[PDB]
CSV table of C-alpha atoms and ligand atoms in Angstrom, one decimal:
chain,number,residue,atom,x,y,z
A,1,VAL,CA,0.0,0.0,0.0
A,2,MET,CA,1.4,3.4,-1.0
A,3,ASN,CA,2.8,5.3,2.0
A,4,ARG,CA,1.4,2.6,4.2
A,5,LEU,CA,-1.7,4.8,4.3
A,6,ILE,CA,-5.3,3.7,3.6
A,7,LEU,CA,-7.9,6.4,3.5
A,8,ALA,CA,-11.2,5.5,5.3
A,9,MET,CA,-13.7,7.5,3.2
A,10,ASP,CA,-16.7,7.7,5.4
A,11,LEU,CA,-18.2,11.0,4.1
A,12,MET,CA,-21.8,10.4,3.0
A,13,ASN,CA,-22.3,12.3,-0.2
A,14,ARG,CA,-20.6,11.7,-3.5
A,15,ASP,CA,-19.4,15.3,-4.1
A,16,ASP,CA,-17.7,15.6,-0.7
A,17,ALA,CA,-16.3,12.0,-0.8
A,18,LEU,CA,-14.9,12.5,-4.3
A,19,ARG,CA,-13.6,16.0,-3.6
A,20,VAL,CA,-11.7,15.1,-0.5
A,21,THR,CA,-10.3,11.9,-2.0
A,22,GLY,CA,-9.1,13.9,-5.0
A,23,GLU,CA,-7.3,16.3,-2.6
A,24,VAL,CA,-5.2,13.4,-1.2
A,25,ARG,CA,-5.0,11.2,-4.3
A,26,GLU,CA,-1.2,11.8,-4.6
A,27,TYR,CA,-0.6,10.3,-1.1
A,28,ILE,CA,-2.6,7.0,-1.4
A,29,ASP,CA,-3.4,4.2,-3.8
A,30,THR,CA,-5.8,2.4,-1.5
A,31,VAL,CA,-9.2,3.5,-0.2
A,32,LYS,CA,-11.5,1.8,2.3
A,33,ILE,CA,-15.2,2.4,1.5
A,34,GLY,CA,-17.9,1.4,4.0
A,35,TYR,CA,-21.6,1.5,4.5
A,36,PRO,CA,-21.9,5.2,5.3
A,37,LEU,CA,-21.0,6.1,1.7
A,38,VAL,CA,-22.3,3.0,0.0
A,39,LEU,CA,-25.7,3.1,1.6
A,40,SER,CA,-26.0,6.8,0.9
A,41,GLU,CA,-24.8,6.8,-2.7
A,42,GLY,CA,-25.2,3.2,-3.9
A,43,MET,CA,-22.6,0.5,-4.6
A,44,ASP,CA,-21.8,2.1,-8.0
A,45,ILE,CA,-19.7,4.5,-6.0
A,46,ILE,CA,-17.0,1.8,-5.8
A,47,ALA,CA,-16.6,1.8,-9.6
A,48,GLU,CA,-16.5,5.6,-9.6
A,49,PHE,CA,-13.6,5.6,-7.2
A,50,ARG,CA,-11.6,3.0,-9.1
A,51,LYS,CA,-12.1,4.8,-12.4
A,52,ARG,CA,-11.4,8.3,-11.1
A,53,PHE,CA,-8.4,7.5,-8.9
A,54,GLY,CA,-7.2,4.1,-10.2
A,55,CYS,CA,-7.0,3.1,-6.5
A,56,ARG,CA,-7.4,-0.3,-4.8
A,57,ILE,CA,-10.8,-0.5,-3.0
A,58,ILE,CA,-11.3,-2.3,0.3
A,59,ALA,CA,-14.9,-2.7,1.2
A,60,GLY,CA,-15.0,-2.2,4.9
A,61,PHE,CA,-18.3,-4.1,5.3
A,62,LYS,CA,-17.2,-6.3,8.2
A,63,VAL,CA,-19.5,-9.1,7.0
A,64,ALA,CA,-21.1,-10.8,10.0
A,65,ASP,CA,-24.0,-13.0,8.7
A,66,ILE,CA,-24.6,-16.7,8.3
A,67,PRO,CA,-22.6,-18.5,5.5
A,68,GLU,CA,-25.3,-18.3,2.8
A,69,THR,CA,-25.9,-14.6,3.2
A,70,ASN,CA,-22.1,-13.8,3.6
A,71,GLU,CA,-21.7,-15.5,0.2
A,72,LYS,CA,-24.3,-13.2,-1.3
A,73,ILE,CA,-22.8,-10.0,0.2
A,74,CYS,CA,-19.3,-10.9,-1.0
A,75,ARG,CA,-20.6,-11.7,-4.5
A,76,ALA,CA,-22.5,-8.4,-4.8
A,77,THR,CA,-19.5,-6.5,-3.4
A,78,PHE,CA,-16.9,-8.0,-5.7
A,79,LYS,CA,-19.3,-7.7,-8.7
A,80,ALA,CA,-19.3,-3.9,-7.8
A,81,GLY,CA,-15.5,-3.8,-8.2
A,82,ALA,CA,-14.1,-4.1,-4.7
A,83,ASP,CA,-10.6,-5.6,-4.6
A,84,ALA,CA,-11.1,-6.9,-1.0
A,85,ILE,CA,-13.7,-7.1,1.7
A,86,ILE,CA,-13.3,-7.0,5.5
A,87,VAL,CA,-15.0,-9.8,7.3
A,88,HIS,CA,-15.8,-10.2,11.0
A,89,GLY,CA,-14.3,-13.3,12.6
A,90,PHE,CA,-16.6,-13.4,15.6
A,91,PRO,CA,-19.4,-15.2,13.8
A,92,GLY,CA,-17.2,-18.3,13.3
A,93,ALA,CA,-15.2,-20.3,10.7
A,94,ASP,CA,-18.1,-21.3,8.4
A,95,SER,CA,-19.0,-17.7,7.9
A,96,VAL,CA,-15.4,-16.8,7.2
A,97,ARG,CA,-15.0,-19.7,4.8
A,98,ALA,CA,-18.1,-18.6,2.8
A,99,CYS,CA,-16.3,-15.4,2.1
A,100,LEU,CA,-13.0,-17.1,1.3
A,101,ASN,CA,-14.9,-19.3,-1.3
A,102,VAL,CA,-16.3,-16.3,-3.2
A,103,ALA,CA,-13.0,-14.4,-3.0
A,104,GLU,CA,-11.1,-17.3,-4.4
A,105,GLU,CA,-13.7,-17.8,-7.2
A,106,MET,CA,-13.5,-14.1,-8.2
A,107,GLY,CA,-9.8,-13.5,-7.6
A,108,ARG,CA,-10.3,-11.0,-4.7
A,109,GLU,CA,-9.1,-10.8,-1.1
A,110,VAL,CA,-10.6,-11.2,2.3
A,111,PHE,CA,-9.3,-9.3,5.4
A,112,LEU,CA,-10.2,-10.9,8.7
A,113,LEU,CA,-11.2,-8.5,11.5
A,114,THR,CA,-9.9,-9.9,14.8
A,115,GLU,CA,-10.3,-7.2,17.4
A,116,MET,CA,-11.9,-3.8,17.2
A,117,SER,CA,-10.6,-0.4,18.2
A,118,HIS,CA,-13.5,1.1,20.2
A,119,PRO,CA,-13.9,0.8,24.0
A,120,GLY,CA,-16.8,-1.6,23.7
A,121,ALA,CA,-14.6,-4.2,22.0
A,122,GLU,CA,-13.4,-5.0,25.5
A,123,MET,CA,-16.7,-6.6,26.4
A,124,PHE,CA,-16.8,-9.6,24.2
A,125,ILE,CA,-14.5,-9.3,21.2
A,126,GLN,CA,-11.2,-8.9,23.0
A,127,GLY,CA,-11.5,-12.2,24.8
A,128,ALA,CA,-12.0,-14.0,21.5
A,129,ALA,CA,-9.6,-12.1,19.4
A,130,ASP,CA,-6.5,-14.3,19.8
A,131,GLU,CA,-8.6,-17.4,18.9
A,132,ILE,CA,-10.2,-15.6,16.0
A,133,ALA,CA,-6.7,-14.7,14.7
A,134,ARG,CA,-5.6,-18.3,15.1
A,135,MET,CA,-8.7,-19.4,13.2
A,136,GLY,CA,-7.7,-17.2,10.4
A,137,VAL,CA,-4.2,-18.5,10.3
A,138,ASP,CA,-5.5,-22.1,10.3
A,139,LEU,CA,-7.7,-21.3,7.3
A,140,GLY,CA,-4.8,-19.7,5.4
A,141,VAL,CA,-6.1,-16.1,5.7
A,142,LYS,CA,-3.3,-13.8,4.8
A,143,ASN,CA,-4.9,-10.4,5.5
A,144,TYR,CA,-5.9,-9.1,8.9
A,145,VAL,CA,-7.3,-6.0,10.7
A,146,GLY,CA,-6.3,-5.2,14.3
A,147,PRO,CA,-6.7,-2.2,16.7
A,148,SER,CA,-4.3,0.8,16.7
A,149,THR,CA,-5.8,1.8,20.0
A,150,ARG,CA,-4.3,-1.2,21.8
A,151,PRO,CA,-0.6,-1.5,20.9
A,152,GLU,CA,0.1,-4.6,23.0
A,153,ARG,CA,-3.0,-6.3,21.5
A,154,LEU,CA,-1.9,-5.4,18.0
A,155,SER,CA,1.6,-6.7,18.8
A,156,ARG,CA,0.1,-10.0,20.0
A,157,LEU,CA,-2.0,-10.3,16.9
A,158,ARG,CA,1.2,-9.8,14.8
A,159,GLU,CA,2.9,-12.6,16.7
A,160,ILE,CA,0.0,-14.9,16.0
A,161,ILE,CA,-0.3,-14.2,12.3
A,162,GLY,CA,3.4,-14.2,11.6
A,163,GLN,CA,5.6,-11.8,9.7
A,164,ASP,CA,4.4,-12.9,6.3
A,165,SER,CA,0.8,-11.9,6.9
A,166,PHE,CA,-0.6,-8.4,5.9
A,167,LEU,CA,-2.0,-6.4,8.8
A,168,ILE,CA,-3.9,-3.1,8.6
A,169,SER,CA,-5.0,-1.1,11.5
A,170,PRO,CA,-7.8,1.5,12.2
A,171,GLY,CA,-8.1,3.8,15.2
A,172,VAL,CA,-5.3,6.2,14.2
A,173,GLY,CA,-5.9,9.8,14.8
A,174,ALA,CA,-9.5,10.5,15.9
A,175,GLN,CA,-9.5,7.4,18.1
A,176,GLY,CA,-6.2,8.2,19.6
A,177,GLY,CA,-3.9,5.8,17.8
A,178,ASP,CA,-0.4,6.9,16.9
A,179,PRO,CA,0.8,6.3,13.3
A,180,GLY,CA,4.4,5.4,14.1
A,181,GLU,CA,3.6,3.2,17.1
A,182,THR,CA,0.9,1.4,15.1
A,183,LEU,CA,3.3,0.7,12.2
A,184,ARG,CA,5.7,-1.1,14.6
A,185,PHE,CA,3.3,-4.0,14.1
A,186,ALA,CA,0.9,-3.2,11.2
A,187,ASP,CA,2.0,-2.9,7.6
A,188,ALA,CA,-0.5,-0.1,6.9
A,189,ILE,CA,-2.7,2.3,8.9
A,190,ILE,CA,-6.3,3.2,8.2
A,191,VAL,CA,-7.1,6.9,8.7
A,192,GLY,CA,-10.4,8.5,8.3
A,193,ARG,CA,-11.6,11.6,10.1
A,194,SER,CA,-8.1,12.9,10.9
A,195,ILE,CA,-7.9,13.4,7.1
A,196,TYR,CA,-11.4,13.9,5.7
A,197,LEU,CA,-12.6,16.2,8.4
A,198,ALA,CA,-9.4,18.3,8.5
A,199,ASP,CA,-9.5,21.9,7.3
A,200,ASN,CA,-6.8,20.9,4.8
A,201,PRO,CA,-7.0,17.1,4.0
A,202,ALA,CA,-3.8,17.2,1.9
A,203,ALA,CA,-1.8,18.8,4.7
A,204,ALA,CA,-3.2,16.3,7.2
A,205,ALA,CA,-2.2,13.4,5.0
A,206,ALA,CA,1.2,14.9,4.3
A,207,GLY,CA,1.7,15.5,8.0
A,208,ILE,CA,1.0,11.8,8.8
A,209,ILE,CA,3.4,10.6,6.1
A,210,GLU,CA,6.1,13.1,7.3
A,211,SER,CA,5.8,11.6,10.8
A,212,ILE,CA,6.4,8.1,9.5
A,213,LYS,CA,9.0,8.8,6.8
B,1,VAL,CA,-46.6,-8.8,13.4
B,2,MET,CA,-49.3,-10.3,11.1
B,3,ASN,CA,-49.4,-14.1,11.5
B,4,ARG,CA,-46.2,-13.9,13.6
B,5,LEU,CA,-44.5,-14.3,10.2
B,6,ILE,CA,-41.7,-12.0,9.0
B,7,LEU,CA,-40.5,-12.6,5.4
B,8,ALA,CA,-36.7,-12.4,5.0
B,9,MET,CA,-36.5,-11.1,1.4
B,10,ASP,CA,-33.0,-12.0,0.3
B,11,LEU,CA,-33.5,-12.3,-3.4
B,12,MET,CA,-31.0,-10.0,-5.2
B,13,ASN,CA,-32.9,-8.4,-8.0
B,14,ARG,CA,-35.9,-6.0,-7.9
B,15,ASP,CA,-38.3,-7.9,-10.2
B,16,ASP,CA,-37.9,-11.2,-8.4
B,17,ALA,CA,-38.0,-9.7,-4.9
B,18,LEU,CA,-41.1,-7.6,-5.6
B,19,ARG,CA,-42.8,-10.4,-7.5
B,20,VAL,CA,-42.4,-13.0,-4.7
B,21,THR,CA,-43.3,-10.5,-1.9
B,22,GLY,CA,-46.4,-9.6,-3.9
B,23,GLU,CA,-47.3,-13.3,-4.0
B,24,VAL,CA,-47.3,-13.5,-0.2
B,25,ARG,CA,-48.4,-10.0,0.7
B,26,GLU,CA,-51.8,-11.2,2.1
B,27,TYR,CA,-49.9,-13.3,4.7
B,28,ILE,CA,-47.5,-10.7,6.1
B,29,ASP,CA,-47.2,-7.1,7.1
B,30,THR,CA,-43.5,-7.1,8.0
B,31,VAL,CA,-40.5,-7.8,5.7
B,32,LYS,CA,-36.9,-8.0,6.7
B,33,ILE,CA,-34.6,-6.5,4.0
B,34,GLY,CA,-30.9,-7.1,4.2
B,35,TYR,CA,-27.7,-6.4,2.3
B,36,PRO,CA,-28.2,-8.9,-0.5
B,37,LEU,CA,-31.1,-6.9,-1.8
B,38,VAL,CA,-30.0,-3.4,-0.7
B,39,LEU,CA,-26.4,-3.7,-2.1
B,40,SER,CA,-27.7,-5.1,-5.4
B,41,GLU,CA,-30.6,-2.6,-6.0
B,42,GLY,CA,-29.9,0.3,-3.7
B,43,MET,CA,-31.4,1.6,-0.5
B,44,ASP,CA,-34.3,3.1,-2.4
B,45,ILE,CA,-35.7,-0.4,-2.5
B,46,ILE,CA,-36.9,0.0,1.1
B,47,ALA,CA,-39.2,2.9,0.1
B,48,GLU,CA,-40.4,0.8,-2.8
B,49,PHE,CA,-41.5,-2.0,-0.5
B,50,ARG,CA,-43.2,0.3,1.9
B,51,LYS,CA,-45.2,2.0,-0.8
B,52,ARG,CA,-46.1,-1.1,-2.8
B,53,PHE,CA,-47.0,-3.3,0.2
B,54,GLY,CA,-47.7,-0.9,3.1
B,55,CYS,CA,-45.5,-3.2,5.2
B,56,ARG,CA,-43.2,-2.6,8.1
B,57,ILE,CA,-39.6,-2.9,7.1
B,58,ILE,CA,-36.9,-4.3,9.4
B,59,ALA,CA,-33.4,-3.6,8.0
B,60,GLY,CA,-31.5,-6.8,8.8
B,61,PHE,CA,-28.1,-5.0,8.6
B,62,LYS,CA,-26.8,-6.4,11.9
B,63,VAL,CA,-24.7,-3.2,12.5
B,64,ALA,CA,-21.3,-4.1,14.0
B,65,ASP,CA,-19.0,-1.1,13.7
B,66,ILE,CA,-17.6,1.5,16.1
B,67,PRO,CA,-20.1,3.9,17.7
B,68,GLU,CA,-19.5,6.8,15.2
B,69,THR,CA,-20.0,4.6,12.1
B,70,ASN,CA,-22.9,2.8,13.7
B,71,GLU,CA,-24.6,6.2,14.1
B,72,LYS,CA,-24.1,7.0,10.4
B,73,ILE,CA,-25.4,3.6,9.2
B,74,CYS,CA,-28.5,3.9,11.3
B,75,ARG,CA,-29.1,7.4,10.2
B,76,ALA,CA,-28.8,6.5,6.5
B,77,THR,CA,-31.0,3.4,7.0
B,78,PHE,CA,-33.8,5.2,8.8
B,79,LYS,CA,-33.7,8.1,6.3
B,80,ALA,CA,-34.3,5.4,3.7
B,81,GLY,CA,-37.6,4.5,5.5
B,82,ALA,CA,-36.7,1.5,7.6
B,83,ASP,CA,-38.9,1.1,10.7
B,84,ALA,CA,-36.3,-0.9,12.6
B,85,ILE,CA,-32.7,-2.0,12.3
B,86,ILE,CA,-31.0,-5.1,13.6
B,87,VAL,CA,-27.8,-4.5,15.6
B,88,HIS,CA,-25.1,-7.0,16.6
B,89,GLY,CA,-24.6,-7.0,20.3
B,90,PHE,CA,-21.1,-8.6,20.3
B,91,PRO,CA,-19.3,-5.3,19.6
B,92,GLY,CA,-20.3,-3.9,23.0
B,93,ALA,CA,-22.6,-1.4,24.8
B,94,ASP,CA,-21.3,1.8,23.2
B,95,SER,CA,-21.9,0.5,19.7
B,96,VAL,CA,-25.4,-0.5,20.7
B,97,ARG,CA,-26.1,2.9,22.4
B,98,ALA,CA,-25.0,4.7,19.3
B,99,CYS,CA,-27.9,2.9,17.5
B,100,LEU,CA,-30.3,3.6,20.3
B,101,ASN,CA,-29.6,7.3,20.2
B,102,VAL,CA,-30.4,7.6,16.5
B,103,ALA,CA,-33.5,5.3,16.8
B,104,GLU,CA,-34.9,7.5,19.6
B,105,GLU,CA,-34.1,10.7,17.7
B,106,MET,CA,-35.9,9.4,14.5
B,107,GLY,CA,-38.7,7.5,16.2
B,108,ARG,CA,-37.6,4.1,15.0
B,109,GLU,CA,-36.7,0.7,16.6
B,110,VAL,CA,-33.5,-1.3,17.4
B,111,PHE,CA,-33.5,-5.1,17.5
B,112,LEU,CA,-30.6,-6.5,19.4
B,113,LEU,CA,-29.1,-9.7,17.9
B,114,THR,CA,-27.9,-11.9,20.7
B,115,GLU,CA,-27.1,-15.4,19.5
B,116,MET,CA,-26.9,-16.4,15.8
B,117,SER,CA,-28.5,-19.4,14.2
B,118,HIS,CA,-25.6,-21.0,12.1
B,119,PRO,CA,-23.1,-23.6,13.3
B,120,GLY,CA,-20.3,-21.2,13.6
B,121,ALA,CA,-22.2,-19.2,16.2
B,122,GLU,CA,-21.0,-21.7,18.7
B,123,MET,CA,-17.4,-20.7,18.5
B,124,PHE,CA,-17.6,-17.2,20.0
B,125,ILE,CA,-21.1,-15.8,20.0
B,126,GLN,CA,-22.9,-18.4,22.0
B,127,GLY,CA,-20.6,-18.0,25.0
B,128,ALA,CA,-21.3,-14.3,25.1
B,129,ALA,CA,-25.0,-14.4,24.2
B,130,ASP,CA,-26.6,-14.5,27.7
B,131,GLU,CA,-24.4,-11.5,28.7
B,132,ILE,CA,-25.3,-9.7,25.4
B,133,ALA,CA,-29.0,-10.2,26.2
B,134,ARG,CA,-28.5,-8.9,29.8
B,135,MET,CA,-26.7,-5.9,28.3
B,136,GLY,CA,-29.7,-5.1,26.2
B,137,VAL,CA,-32.1,-5.5,29.1
B,138,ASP,CA,-29.9,-3.1,31.2
B,139,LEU,CA,-30.1,-0.5,28.4
B,140,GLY,CA,-33.8,-0.8,28.0
B,141,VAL,CA,-33.7,-2.6,24.7
B,142,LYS,CA,-37.2,-4.1,24.0
B,143,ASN,CA,-36.6,-6.0,20.7
B,144,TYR,CA,-34.4,-9.0,20.3
B,145,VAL,CA,-33.3,-11.6,17.8
B,146,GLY,CA,-32.5,-15.2,18.9
B,147,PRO,CA,-31.8,-18.6,17.1
B,148,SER,CA,-34.6,-20.9,16.0
B,149,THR,CA,-32.0,-23.6,15.5
B,150,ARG,CA,-31.2,-23.9,19.3
B,151,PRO,CA,-34.6,-24.1,21.2
B,152,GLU,CA,-33.0,-24.3,24.6
B,153,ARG,CA,-30.9,-21.3,23.9
B,154,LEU,CA,-33.9,-19.4,22.6
B,155,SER,CA,-35.8,-20.4,25.7
B,156,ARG,CA,-32.9,-19.1,27.9
B,157,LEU,CA,-32.9,-15.8,26.0
B,158,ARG,CA,-36.6,-15.4,26.6
B,159,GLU,CA,-36.1,-15.9,30.3
B,160,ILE,CA,-33.4,-13.2,30.4
B,161,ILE,CA,-35.4,-10.6,28.4
B,162,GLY,CA,-38.7,-11.2,30.1
B,163,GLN,CA,-42.2,-11.8,28.8
B,164,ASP,CA,-42.7,-8.1,27.9
B,165,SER,CA,-39.8,-8.0,25.4
B,166,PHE,CA,-40.4,-8.7,21.7
B,167,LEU,CA,-38.4,-11.6,20.3
B,168,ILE,CA,-38.1,-12.6,16.6
B,169,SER,CA,-36.2,-15.7,15.4
B,170,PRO,CA,-34.5,-16.7,12.2
B,171,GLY,CA,-33.4,-20.2,11.2
B,172,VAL,CA,-36.9,-21.6,10.5
B,173,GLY,CA,-37.2,-23.8,7.5
B,174,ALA,CA,-34.0,-23.9,5.5
B,175,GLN,CA,-31.8,-24.0,8.6
B,176,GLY,CA,-33.9,-26.6,10.3
B,177,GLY,CA,-35.9,-24.7,12.8
B,178,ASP,CA,-39.5,-25.6,13.5
B,179,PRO,CA,-42.2,-22.9,13.3
B,180,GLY,CA,-44.3,-24.1,16.2
B,181,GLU,CA,-41.4,-25.0,18.5
B,182,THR,CA,-39.7,-21.6,17.9
B,183,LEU,CA,-43.0,-19.8,18.7
B,184,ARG,CA,-43.0,-21.4,22.2
B,185,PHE,CA,-40.5,-18.6,23.0
B,186,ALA,CA,-40.3,-16.1,20.1
B,187,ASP,CA,-43.2,-13.7,19.3
B,188,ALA,CA,-42.5,-14.0,15.5
B,189,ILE,CA,-40.5,-16.2,13.2
B,190,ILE,CA,-38.3,-15.0,10.3
B,191,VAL,CA,-38.6,-17.1,7.2
B,192,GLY,CA,-36.6,-16.6,4.0
B,193,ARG,CA,-35.7,-19.4,1.5
B,194,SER,CA,-38.5,-21.8,2.6
B,195,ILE,CA,-40.8,-19.2,1.1
B,196,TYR,CA,-39.0,-17.2,-1.5
B,197,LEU,CA,-37.2,-20.2,-3.1
B,198,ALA,CA,-40.4,-22.4,-3.0
B,199,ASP,CA,-42.1,-23.5,-6.2
B,200,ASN,CA,-45.2,-21.8,-4.8
B,201,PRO,CA,-44.3,-19.1,-2.3
B,202,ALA,CA,-47.9,-18.4,-1.4
B,203,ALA,CA,-48.6,-22.1,-0.7
B,204,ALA,CA,-45.4,-22.2,1.4
B,205,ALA,CA,-46.4,-19.3,3.5
B,206,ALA,CA,-49.9,-20.6,3.9
B,207,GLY,CA,-48.5,-24.0,4.9
B,208,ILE,CA,-46.4,-22.4,7.7
B,209,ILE,CA,-49.4,-20.4,8.9
B,210,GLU,CA,-51.5,-23.5,8.9
B,211,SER,CA,-49.0,-25.4,11.1
B,212,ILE,CA,-49.3,-22.6,13.7
B,213,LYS,CA,-53.0,-21.8,13.6
C,1,LIG,O1,-12.0,-1.9,14.8
C,1,LIG,C1,-12.4,-1.2,13.9
C,1,LIG,N1,-12.3,0.2,14.1
C,1,LIG,C2,-12.6,1.1,13.1
C,1,LIG,O2,-12.5,2.3,13.4
C,1,LIG,N2,-13.1,0.6,11.9
C,1,LIG,C3,-13.4,1.5,10.8
C,1,LIG,O3,-12.2,2.2,10.4
C,1,LIG,C4,-12.4,3.6,10.2
C,1,LIG,C5,-11.8,4.5,11.3
C,1,LIG,O4,-11.9,5.8,10.9
C,1,LIG,P1,-11.4,7.0,11.8
C,1,LIG,O5,-12.3,8.1,11.3
C,1,LIG,O6,-10.0,7.2,11.4
C,1,LIG,O7,-11.6,6.7,13.2
C,1,LIG,C6,-13.9,3.7,10.1
C,1,LIG,O8,-14.4,3.5,8.7
C,1,LIG,C7,-14.4,2.6,11.0
C,1,LIG,O9,-15.8,2.2,10.7
C,1,LIG,C8,-13.4,-0.7,11.7
C,1,LIG,C9,-12.9,-1.6,12.7
C,1,LIG,F1,-13.0,-2.9,12.4
C,2,LIG,O1,-28.7,-15.5,13.4
C,2,LIG,C1,-29.1,-15.1,12.3
C,2,LIG,N1,-29.5,-16.1,11.4
C,2,LIG,C2,-30.0,-15.7,10.2
C,2,LIG,O2,-30.4,-16.6,9.4
C,2,LIG,N2,-30.1,-14.4,9.9
C,2,LIG,C3,-30.8,-13.9,8.7
C,2,LIG,O3,-32.2,-14.4,8.7
C,2,LIG,C4,-32.5,-14.8,7.4
C,2,LIG,C5,-32.7,-16.3,7.4
C,2,LIG,O4,-33.3,-16.7,6.1
C,2,LIG,P1,-33.6,-18.2,5.8
C,2,LIG,O5,-33.5,-18.2,4.3
C,2,LIG,O6,-35.0,-18.5,6.2
C,2,LIG,O7,-32.5,-19.1,6.4
C,2,LIG,C6,-31.5,-14.3,6.5
C,2,LIG,O8,-31.7,-13.0,6.0
C,2,LIG,C7,-30.3,-14.3,7.3
C,2,LIG,O9,-29.2,-13.4,6.9
C,2,LIG,C8,-29.6,-13.4,10.7
C,2,LIG,C9,-29.2,-13.8,12.0
C,2,LIG,F1,-28.9,-12.8,12.9
C,3,LIG,CL1,-13.9,-1.5,8.3
C,4,LIG,CL1,-30.8,-10.2,10.0
């Protein structure tokens, strides 16, 4: 990923989303698009980003349904042009495998979300996170998502998945995570509000990159 | 809910989804629409269902993001016309409260998903389900979702939420759940494939209703 920086584009109207992404297009080649934008503007927005910016698109949908429905969601998402999709690991192995099947069939990628970055993640997710990570490793998952807000947890996740696995991490900036510290373990950081809500998105992105040069 | 029957409309194209729902419109007044249909046809499909069938719409999105993003998803979903939204409880209390805030503001409902119906749910969700249910009760949540595939678990969920709470349950039909048995604890059953994939959807719906007269 260019500059180890993935833009989380969660603005909810096409004009703003496209304008801000355009402002920082020179600093990134990977954008994470989620439900805030997709539900507001439609899935066609994914193709718009790919054509306008030539960027990789990660659908941050965090699929968490039964196997059959997960397959349908992945199919629809990849048909829309997404290069990868984020999947929740908490629902179990069968739900993850359903996504892996579609990804292999269509030549796309699955990112396994192991532990989340918000406070509430401590209640139920954290206690299952290490096992979720091991589940991914046992199934051959190569891409993971871990929390920037809990450095020691992110470090443990890295130990479980190994050096060869790709790890991205949200929670940088607005949620309190530090770019440099997070990159001690993750290969790339996900940054949303710190950039898209900044008075000068380009300056914000450049500042983050400067701090991790 | 009419006939204690909620149609899970997971077909992925407008014509088929509307045609099948029309075939069974006399048997239901509540439809659960999820990502398979919404991502394929756009969120405007919710308003289409409401105007064509005059039915209640439950968005089976099972929101499972951080508080800030959950708020955005709920806002977009309710703006689209959904009467209620299903929210995953595993991400914690703050993520649930974010949804409750928007629902209260817009005069809509939140359904808390405790335990899931598929096999993989046993890995991590099941062990946290009773506590997730208690979390909902402590926050004043009145609508819940529990598994038809595990009758004793559904029974335990009912005991935790009390007789006053509203409980709906998926996993009936295709996943093996029995309509009558499930209704010993749930107030309404969610049925998808057993109806929408049937040779005669109307006959399938009528048959289910007949078995629970
Ligand atoms: O654990 C997680 N934490 C997150 O913050 N996210 C997403 O990353 C993004 C974080 O953006 P921020 O604005 O930089 O906080 C946003 O899209 C979230 O929904 C997902 C996760 F899986
Ligand atoms: O635990 C769950 N099990 C489910 O099956 N579902 C949804 O209910 C529906 C079940 O449909 P079926 O075709 O009757 O199995 C479908 O939309 C699922 O995504 C959600 C859940 F939260
Ligand atoms: Cl995400
Ligand atoms: Cl659902």
